[PDB]
Design an enzyme around this catalytic site. Structure first.
Site, PDB file in Angstrom:
ATOM      1  N   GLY A  50      -4.885  -2.022   5.002  1.00  0.00           N
ATOM      2  CA  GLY A  50      -4.084  -3.209   4.627  1.00  0.00           C
ATOM      3  C   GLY A  50      -4.700  -4.496   5.115  1.00  0.00           C
ATOM      4  O   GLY A  50      -4.818  -5.467   4.395  1.00  0.00           O
ATOM      5  N   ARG A  51      -5.086  -4.505   6.382  1.00  0.00           N
ATOM      6  CA  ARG A  51      -5.714  -5.677   6.999  1.00  0.00           C
ATOM      7  C   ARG A  51      -7.159  -5.956   6.566  1.00  0.00           C
ATOM      8  O   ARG A  51      -7.791  -6.947   7.022  1.00  0.00           O
ATOM      9  CB  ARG A  51      -5.605  -5.592   8.538  1.00  0.00           C
ATOM     10  CG  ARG A  51      -6.349  -4.462   9.215  1.00  0.00           C
ATOM     11  CD  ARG A  51      -5.918  -4.307  10.645  1.00  0.00           C
ATOM     12  NE  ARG A  51      -6.404  -3.065  11.226  1.00  0.00           N
ATOM     13  CZ  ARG A  51      -5.716  -1.923  11.297  1.00  0.00           C
ATOM     14  NH1 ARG A  51      -4.476  -1.827  10.872  1.00  0.00           N
ATOM     15  NH2 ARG A  51      -6.291  -0.852  11.807  1.00  0.00           N
ATOM     16  N   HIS A  69      -5.098 -32.078  21.020  1.00  0.00           N
ATOM     17  CA  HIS A  69      -3.911 -32.770  21.445  1.00  0.00           C
ATOM     18  C   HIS A  69      -2.750 -31.839  21.712  1.00  0.00           C
ATOM     19  O   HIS A  69      -1.609 -32.327  21.795  1.00  0.00           O
ATOM     20  CB  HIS A  69      -3.510 -33.743  20.346  1.00  0.00           C
ATOM     21  CG  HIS A  69      -4.593 -34.698  19.988  1.00  0.00           C
ATOM     22  ND1 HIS A  69      -4.724 -35.940  20.589  1.00  0.00           N
ATOM     23  CD2 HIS A  69      -5.606 -34.592  19.087  1.00  0.00           C
ATOM     24  CE1 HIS A  69      -5.775 -36.552  20.066  1.00  0.00           C
ATOM     25  NE2 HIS A  69      -6.351 -35.745  19.183  1.00  0.00           N
ATOM     26  N   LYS A 129       0.819  -1.221   0.000  1.00  0.00           N
ATOM     27  CA  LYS A 129       0.000   0.000   0.000  1.00  0.00           C
ATOM     28  C   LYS A 129       0.843   1.257   0.000  1.00  0.00           C
ATOM     29  O   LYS A 129       0.578   2.173  -0.790  1.00  0.00           O
ATOM     30  CB  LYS A 129      -0.973  -0.018   1.176  1.00  0.00           C
ATOM     31  CG  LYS A 129      -1.965   1.126   1.113  1.00  0.00           C
ATOM     32  CD  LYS A 129      -2.894   1.142   2.242  1.00  0.00           C
ATOM     33  CE  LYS A 129      -3.836   2.386   2.235  1.00  0.00           C
ATOM     34  NZ  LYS A 129      -4.766   2.391   3.425  1.00  0.00           N
ATOM     35  N   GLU A 135      -4.590  -5.659  15.372  1.00  0.00           N
ATOM     36  CA  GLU A 135      -4.053  -4.418  14.849  1.00  0.00           C
ATOM     37  C   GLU A 135      -5.135  -3.327  14.805  1.00  0.00           C
ATOM     38  O   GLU A 135      -4.813  -2.141  14.843  1.00  0.00           O
ATOM     39  CB  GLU A 135      -3.395  -4.586  13.464  1.00  0.00           C
ATOM     40  CG  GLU A 135      -2.406  -3.503  13.130  1.00  0.00           C
ATOM     41  CD  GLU A 135      -1.689  -3.680  11.801  1.00  0.00           C
ATOM     42  OE1 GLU A 135      -2.366  -3.761  10.758  1.00  0.00           O
ATOM     43  OE2 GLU A 135      -0.434  -3.712  11.798  1.00  0.00           O
ATOM     44  N   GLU A 151      10.846  -4.258   4.549  1.00  0.00           N
ATOM     45  CA  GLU A 151      11.014  -5.672   4.189  1.00  0.00           C
ATOM     46  C   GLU A 151      10.673  -5.894   2.712  1.00  0.00           C
ATOM     47  O   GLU A 151      11.355  -6.616   1.979  1.00  0.00           O
ATOM     48  CB  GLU A 151      10.149  -6.569   5.075  1.00  0.00           C
ATOM     49  CG  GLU A 151      10.530  -6.478   6.546  1.00  0.00           C
ATOM     50  CD  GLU A 151       9.625  -5.577   7.365  1.00  0.00           C
ATOM     51  OE1 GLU A 151       9.354  -4.428   6.919  1.00  0.00           O
ATOM     52  OE2 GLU A 151       9.195  -6.014   8.462  1.00  0.00           O
ATOM     53  N   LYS A 197       9.903   1.082  13.536  1.00  0.00           N
ATOM     54  CA  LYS A 197      10.493   1.337  12.236  1.00  0.00           C
ATOM     55  C   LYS A 197      11.608   2.335  12.373  1.00  0.00           C
ATOM     56  O   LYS A 197      12.663   2.162  11.788  1.00  0.00           O
ATOM     57  CB  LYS A 197       9.451   1.854  11.235  1.00  0.00           C
ATOM     58  CG  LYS A 197       8.389   0.804  10.902  1.00  0.00           C
ATOM     59  CD  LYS A 197       7.289   1.371  10.016  1.00  0.00           C
ATOM     60  CE  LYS A 197       6.293   0.335   9.610  1.00  0.00           C
ATOM     61  NZ  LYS A 197       5.286   0.935   8.673  1.00  0.00           N
TER      62      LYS A 197
HETATM   63  O1  F6P Z   1       1.205  -2.788   2.435  1.00  0.00           O
HETATM   64  P1  F6P Z   1       2.334  -2.060   3.151  1.00  0.00           P
HETATM   65  O2  F6P Z   1       2.217  -0.556   2.957  1.00  0.00           O
HETATM   66  O3  F6P Z   1       3.675  -2.559   2.642  1.00  0.00           O
HETATM   67  O4  F6P Z   1       2.230  -2.318   4.747  1.00  0.00           O
HETATM   68  C1  F6P Z   1       2.357  -3.681   5.240  1.00  0.00           C
HETATM   69  C2  F6P Z   1       1.717  -3.823   6.622  1.00  0.00           C
HETATM   70  O5  F6P Z   1       2.394  -3.073   7.670  1.00  0.00           O
HETATM   71  C3  F6P Z   1       1.448  -2.665   8.691  1.00  0.00           C
HETATM   72  O6  F6P Z   1       1.704  -3.192  10.044  1.00  0.00           O
HETATM   73  C4  F6P Z   1       1.666  -1.165   8.749  1.00  0.00           C
HETATM   74  O7  F6P Z   1       3.078  -1.105   9.002  1.00  0.00           O
HETATM   75  C5  F6P Z   1       0.073  -3.168   8.255  1.00  0.00           C
HETATM   76  O8  F6P Z   1      -1.047  -2.344   8.606  1.00  0.00           O
HETATM   77  C6  F6P Z   1       0.272  -3.306   6.735  1.00  0.00           C
HETATM   78  O9  F6P Z   1      -0.685  -4.142   6.147  1.00  0.00           O
HETATM   79  O1  F6P Z   2       0.752 -40.416  20.820  1.00  0.00           O
HETATM   80  P1  F6P Z   2      -0.726 -40.653  21.100  1.00  0.00           P
HETATM   81  O2  F6P Z   2      -0.910 -41.733  22.156  1.00  0.00           O
HETATM   82  O3  F6P Z   2      -1.439 -41.037  19.816  1.00  0.00           O
HETATM   83  O4  F6P Z   2      -1.393 -39.309  21.709  1.00  0.00           O
HETATM   84  C1  F6P Z   2      -1.406 -38.106  20.890  1.00  0.00           C
HETATM   85  C2  F6P Z   2      -1.553 -36.855  21.757  1.00  0.00           C
HETATM   86  O5  F6P Z   2      -2.835 -36.753  22.439  1.00  0.00           O
HETATM   87  C3  F6P Z   2      -2.684 -36.040  23.693  1.00  0.00           C
HETATM   88  O6  F6P Z   2      -3.455 -34.788  23.811  1.00  0.00           O
HETATM   89  C4  F6P Z   2      -3.272 -37.020  24.692  1.00  0.00           C
HETATM   90  O7  F6P Z   2      -4.576 -37.232  24.129  1.00  0.00           O
HETATM   91  C5  F6P Z   2      -1.206 -35.683  23.832  1.00  0.00           C
HETATM   92  O8  F6P Z   2      -0.674 -35.678  25.164  1.00  0.00           O
HETATM   93  C6  F6P Z   2      -0.555 -36.743  22.923  1.00  0.00           C
HETATM   94  O9  F6P Z   2       0.743 -36.386  22.537  1.00  0.00           O
END
Ligand code: F6P
Ligand code: F6P
Ligand code: NA
Ligand code: NA
Lengths: 542, 542
Positions: free
Chosen positions: A262-263, A379, A201, A348, A207, A507
């Site tokens: 932007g968002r 899990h 924008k 934001e 970046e 920034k």
């Molecule tokens: O589209 P731009 O101008 O590169 O901005 C990127 C993003 O940076 C912002 O955090 C503003 O810095 C967001 O609102 C925006 O979408």
């Molecule tokens: O490795 P399992 O016995 O398939 O369990 C998968 C995951 O489910 C749990 O939320 C237990 O249900 C986690 O602690 C576990 O890593």
């Protein structure tokens, strides 16, 4: 002199001591009262900690507020982004009403339509093979270069609508300044068959500019001819003077307007990469789903208005329970970036400490939005949702039908979604658990020692949003619901949801730190706090 | 009768009214006092809201607690998972001390070493081409089928160590019961050249069993010969009887022990898919980095012990500021699943409402862990970190050197990381902003109207963890730091970090809902609450 939403009245509504099990037992119309339908979306808020009195009280606050006027002001192009003196017209990007709308000297209907026709023509030219790279080859890959608002929406939607990909183009997203981002794209694409999009924008984001300079250097390393830039770059921005200065001509620029936050920008030309994946017809369907929700929001009395209810419930909890986060649990793999996307839209927008008048508010505003895809989250962190001692409102997103014929998988996915909300509501008591442990064959001493650890308190709130399917149209509707929730919340809190001044300081400090990193005899380096200074020194020594 | 961590004393430490700018101005040894080094990790906690008095007070609480004993009990195999009557021996999985350790009748050193040798041999056999598919072809693809603890660690580490991939195998992760997960893998792999791993500690997890049955049906649809299962499936579990019952023989099973918690299991044979991506030598390096941190944690006085400090700061904030979340901000694309991984480790461990004795605690325990990769997060939710009114402790992870030679990108990435923490600390005041707006050319009325909206309060805490590089070794160290933080937090709160009883109810309710979905004349259907019932009806009609 704006109405105070988070007042003593709200804090006392809580003393109704809603017990969900008891409400469903005694109120045979609970679901009918506390659910709504909009086209193919079923919005069930019946497992929230409300009754008639609490809801009617919240609705009365919305009615007494400026919300009715603010809704009109948003849609009519009033300058409700009051710190930047801008309209807020993401709604116009998807308009199908064609009602008259002239804002800042432009016919918004003509402006939006014309730019859509340009994006449509570009996508068609590229997909058909009429657009060629500089060596005359057909394009096979699209690389979007952008961050935040210029990245997340397109990335999320391209993923979410993967089954609808149909252009034979692969779409890649470059965002972070961390060169891993750029390199993941450049390592798998051919410069002779790649179209790069610089999406910004402002056209001044550090970046995005670094990434675009590096991508251009890559393209020119291959071709060794500056004229190649014409066949391999387009730009999306509100600052076309800056695009020209970068070296891309105006026929290769796709404009956006200052009134597109932007968002809230995926609906604009920033959505180009979406159309490059799923075709322009499907992009129009995405827009049309959002329009349907816009029409619902604009026209519907508050008691039957889904975004208004979503907003009232969320702000009620964060006011009266002093909760500081909300969990969003999408029960579909395709929605893996949906939380990330709404984190920007929500936090934001509503992470603000001052009201419209600039006064520091003495009530909490936007809270942390987090979550994760189901059933995986079950899990990972649902343990805390079930047995932790943090109050956290929960939204579930369920999709009735998927894109494949593994019906047993789809049925299990939904059963789990509905079981999780049921579990939050009911819990399991000590006596239930103790009796279960005895029936499982534990002796009394063992059962008594363990039972307390298995108790699940229950009475925890959720909302379930059920879509018939995850289509371009239904996804567009779903995103718009949240856009409007956010809007309503900001209006009730008397804040500006549409600026983002908080990012400016970082920034500025980043530029000073770069100077300090390059020259330790600089004023910049001498003025650093010592933590920053020693972090820079630790990087230099490694 | 365990020491109370969150007591009135902690609540009053806050009345020191720490001002970060003022501390750095007046204390020329602030960074030296509030930073630590462990090998290639620099831990800078100097931007936290502490001074000598606050830290020494927190350290005294740790000293007075049972922590010293609990650390020994964990490492020596005492049954500190007291509700399940199990040891907690993820540390033993990466041991390099070779000290004697006999637990539950097994020589833990022999057990761990032997299973590592088996995994190493499997990976080598497959990568070398000695293992062939049923039609005699060399394996090209590995598909891990697992959820939660049997998915997240391998997935996160394989991503994080992408530059170290070296086996010529592609590794895929199937997890959700949503068949999109399975189908994303099966659509890009050939049954004749794919090795599937069924990873499940319990071997009873619904999603994993459905996925494995569907993957087996796919393999057998291709080969039409049940004998093909032998060349295309291995299993990782603690329940080998159940693996046999599924149809995989014991020579194809890789055991894990009851004392390996799922969310602490990547170090065990569950890490097989990691070794399949990066080779077994790099897997040993990952383990060795964790060992280095284990040794640090076990041997170091608390004032110089990184996990103990991490834990004290986190629990201090959530006690005294009543914060309900923590933000984790990894400034490297490779760490894109690191937050997701630590959400399980942290929240599934410490989201508990009862103490070891089974008493409901009257202090808050584990809080929400969330965040996102930098610099992207700067453009999504840092607005709220800077200008919201929610107290949120922040951890930054910075990596000094990356894997490429875009030095300008790497320098900008780090400058941004350090600028964000500097911005949190400093903010910008009304007078600073007002003067900047005048200098930018606004008139006094305009400057006065806008300035309040640009004020950034500052004085917000952060920790920066700087790694020299993101290698297998440094990643292993980094994960272990957080494992031990979590442990220390649970000990200070007098909870069991190592059970997860809260997930049981949802599993049970999911089975009942599946019955209700298949037969509306069932007792299950008649006993539903009406929200669940109408959600099932809405799915059936679509
Ligand atoms: O589209 P731009 O101008 O590169 O901005 C990127 C993003 O940076 C912002 O955090 C503003 O810095 C967001 O609102 C925006 O979408
Ligand atoms: O490795 P399992 O016995 O398939 O369990 C998968 C995951 O489910 C749990 O939320 C237990 O249900 C986690 O602690 C576990 O890593
Ligand atoms: Na009104
Ligand atoms: Na002690």
């Amino acid at each position: 002199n704006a109405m105070l939403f988070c007042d003593d009245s709200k804090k006392y509504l809580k003393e109704q001591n809603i017990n969900l099990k008891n409400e469903f037992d005694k109120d045979d119309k609970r679901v009918e009262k506390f659910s709504l339908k909009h086209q193919n979306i079923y919005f069930d808020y019946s497992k929230n900690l409300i009754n008639d009195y609490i809801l009617k009280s919240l609705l009365e606050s919305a009615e007494k507020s400026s919300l009715k006027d603010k809704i009109k002001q948003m849609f009519n192009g009033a300058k409700i982004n009051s710190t930047e003196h801008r309209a807020v017209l993401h709604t116009a990007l998807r308009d199908l009403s064609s009602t008259p709308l002239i804002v800042d000297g432009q016919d918004i209907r003509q402006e939006v339509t014309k730019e859509k026709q340009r994006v449509k023509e570009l996508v068609e030219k590229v997909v058909s093979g009429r657009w060629r790279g500089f060596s005359g080859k057909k394009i096979t890959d699209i690389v979007n270069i952008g961050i935040g608002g210029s990245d997340l929406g397109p990335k999320m939607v391209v993923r979410a609508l993967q089954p609808y990909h149909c252009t034979d183009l692969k779409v890649h997203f470059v965002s972070n300044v961390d060169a891993d981002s750029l390199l993941q794209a450049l390592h798998v694409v051919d410069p002779e068959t790649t179209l790069l999009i610089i999406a910004s924008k402002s056209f001044s984001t550090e970046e995005t500019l670094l990434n675009s300079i590096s991508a251009r250097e890559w393209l020119l390393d291959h071709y060794e001819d500056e004229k190649a830039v014409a066949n391999h770059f387009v730009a999306i921005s509100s600052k076309l003077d800056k695009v020209k200065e970068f070296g891309i001509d105006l026929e290769h620029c796709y404009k956006m307007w200052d009134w597109v936050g932007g968002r809230y920008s995926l609906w604009s030309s920033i959505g180009m990469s979406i159309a490059f994946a799923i075709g322009y017809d499907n992009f129009e369907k995405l827009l049309a789903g959002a329009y349907s929700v816009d029409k619902h929001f604009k026209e519907t009395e508050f008691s039957k208005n889904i975004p208004v209810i979503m907003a009232l419930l969320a702000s009620y909890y964060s006011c009266t329970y002093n909760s500081q986060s909300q969990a969003l649990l999408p029960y579909d793999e395709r929605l893996c970036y949906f939380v990330d996307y709404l984190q920007q839209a929500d936090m934001e927008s509503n992470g603000k400490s001052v009201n419209i008048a600039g006064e520091t508010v003495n009530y909490q505003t936007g809270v942390v939005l987090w979550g994760g895809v189901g059933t995986n989250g079950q899990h990972a962190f649902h343990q805390l949702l079930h047995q932790g001692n943090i109050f956290i409102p929960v939204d579930f997103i369920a999709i009735a039908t998927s894109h494949h014929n593994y019906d047993n998988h789809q049925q299990a996915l939904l059963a789990n979604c509905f079981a999780q909300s049921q579990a939050l509501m009911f819990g399991q008591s000590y006596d239930m658990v103790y009796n279960e442990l005895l029936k499982s064959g534990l002796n009394e001493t063992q059962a008594k020692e363990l039972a307390a650890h298995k108790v699940i308190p229950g009475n925890r709130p959720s909302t379930t949003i059920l879509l018939d399917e995850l289509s371009p149209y239904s996804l567009g509707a779903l995103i718009a619901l949240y856009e409007h929730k956010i809007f309503v919340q900001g209006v009730l809190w008397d804040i500006n949801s549409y600026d983002q001044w908080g990012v400016e300081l970082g920034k500025k400090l980043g530029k000073n730190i770069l100077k300090a990193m390059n020259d330790d005899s600089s004023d910049e380096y001498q003025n650093l706090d010592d933590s920053t200074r020693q972090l820079i020194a630790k990087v230099k020594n490694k």
